[PDB]
Amino acid sequence: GVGSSSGNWHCDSQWLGDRVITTSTRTWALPTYNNHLYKQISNSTSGGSSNDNAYFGYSTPWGYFDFNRFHCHFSPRDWQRLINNNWGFRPKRLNFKLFN
Amino acid sequence: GVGSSSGNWHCDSQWLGDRVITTSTRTWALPTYNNHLYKQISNSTSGGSSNDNAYFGYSTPWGYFDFNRFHCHFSPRDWQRLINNNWGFRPKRLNFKLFN
Amino acid sequence: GVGSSSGNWHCDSQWLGDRVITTSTRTWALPTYNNHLYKQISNSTSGGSSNDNAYFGYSTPWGYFDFNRFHCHFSPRDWQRLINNNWGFRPKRLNFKLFNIQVKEVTDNNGVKTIANNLTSTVQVFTDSDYQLPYVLGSAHEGCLPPFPADVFMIPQYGYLTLNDGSQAVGRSSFYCLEYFPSQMLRTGNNFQFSYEFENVPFHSSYAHSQSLDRLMNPLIDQYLYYLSKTINGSGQNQQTLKFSVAGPSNMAVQGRNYIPGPSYRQQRVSTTVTQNNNSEFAWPGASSWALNGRNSLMNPGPAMASHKEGEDRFFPLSGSLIFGKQGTGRDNVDADKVMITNEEEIKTTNPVATESYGQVATNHQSAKAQAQTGWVQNQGILPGMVWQDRDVYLQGPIWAKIPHTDGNFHPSPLMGGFGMKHPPPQILIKNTPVPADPPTAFNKDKLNSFITQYSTGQVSVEIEWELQKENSKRWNPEIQYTSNYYKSNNVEFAVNTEGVYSEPRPIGTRYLTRNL
């Protein structure tokens, strides 16, 4: 419905023995890209360059979600906990939500 | 028996969730004190002093075991673990052995 | 009890189909090390040195048990059986026993030494089963069980190194107290034992190849591939052409192949005929080395490479092979007849020669002007499609090594030979418990400095079960076998002399049987 929220703000960390679960929530804005068009791009369209910098490709009207950085998930204090107390870590599970 | 050991050397620390168990083993030597006698002692026997330093008491032929210091139980690294990761601690249980 | 033995003498070998079980018992003596103290050591305490030799570490009052050599378990005859009849072997199980402990006290008057029993003293023993201590086994050190079962041996002292900056330490350096481990305490009458299962490791290759990597083709049939054979029609100007020929039995060097020899790291060549060597000092300056944090280390023995070409057995790589000492050989500047130089000639069929370039590569573009130019490859890393053999093991050599705990490694077979394991047989540490002399009759807070002089002796047993890999060759002609020579001599090889000294006259490898590629 229009007048009902689709989700809550979830942002904390839980340290559970040999596991740690991080949760992050952020506010995003998405514009219209490319005037809804697909465009061919190249160093020709960028103005030319040397051979080492030539390319050919496409830009799309879509955007994308990226969280491939550690500070997207760990606060500085949580990072301190992790690195001061552990020989190792690795990711196991992921859950992703898009709402409101 | 004469040819059988009465105990083993136990010295480590176990960190178990919200508990830590420290174990310490040391080698001790005990002499004969006072030539097996009880003696009355005082500042008179010590050579005299001011009023603020006067005393009267007894020395015994016995010795005693003391472990009332934190480094008797915690290695420096264990102390670092404790103080860098906890808001509090307190002692709960004690076990004491004398052997060999 | 005092009057009852804690174990028996077990020393033999059982050959049971595809298994062999070795058992060894020896008599050991353990002194008090360091006056019961931990001491910081460095090249400063050793007297200084160059930058390449600086270190920082600690010596401990503990000793340790090492049996990481093949002659600790195999008699020469058993080794002959193994290597003459098997393509492979590997260790599976281990059992360790320590028993018949005797602790003695020594009193030295003005002119007499008296040794007596101390029935109430203890020895402490423990295994580093969690691999929490620096692993000093796997550095080819002295102090293992002696090859001859009748020899009484002295237990070596434990020490370790940590991070150093010159002779100084950094904040990252670790100090380990071995009393901070739980250990078993033994009076005369107690014994100690434990069992261990080896990791799954590949069989060692106790065979040589009867084929060469460049000779794997049918010598009667052509290939269906062509090779460029001529680029000029003949003498004169403007004679350029392209001619192609079938690669066949007449030109085996240009045939297409699926697999290539393994990697290389070139060594300097030294002749045992000294007059053929250059009249200069090149032991250090001419040696191959690698650098780490500004320190140079010898590349020794380095990657497994063939020692020499055919008919050039007088040449050896400068630091590319294991050199053992003969019985009674000193430690400083001994002659070549006093040492035993091994040679890995059996792997010349897959591995490049240690003292040669790997090959040639193009280094330009030829055109109509520049001619075709090639360059020598002195060190070649791993390439896809490369095959190689590892270094052989010896009756006098090491058995296993601990793979360093790192993010990455490649083919972690130890470079001095043997089996590389992440969880090798654990270190076994032993120490005489200190017994103070008479303390003063007034309290003093300082640690006691006066101790009764003590040492200990006992028996140690190690039993290893090994799995064998038998040969089922279809070769018609007889194989090469390790054998004794009938010709008469003053002594018997692998025996004692008139003075009672046992010696091993030569190194014995494992590669006598043959296999195809």
TrEMBL record, chains A, B:
Subcellular localization: Virion
Top-level taxonomic group: Viruses
Family: Belongs to the parvoviridae capsid protein family.
Name of this protein: Capsid protein VP1
Naturally occurring in which organism (per UniProt): Adeno-associated virus 9
Part of the whole protein covered: 220 to 319 of 736
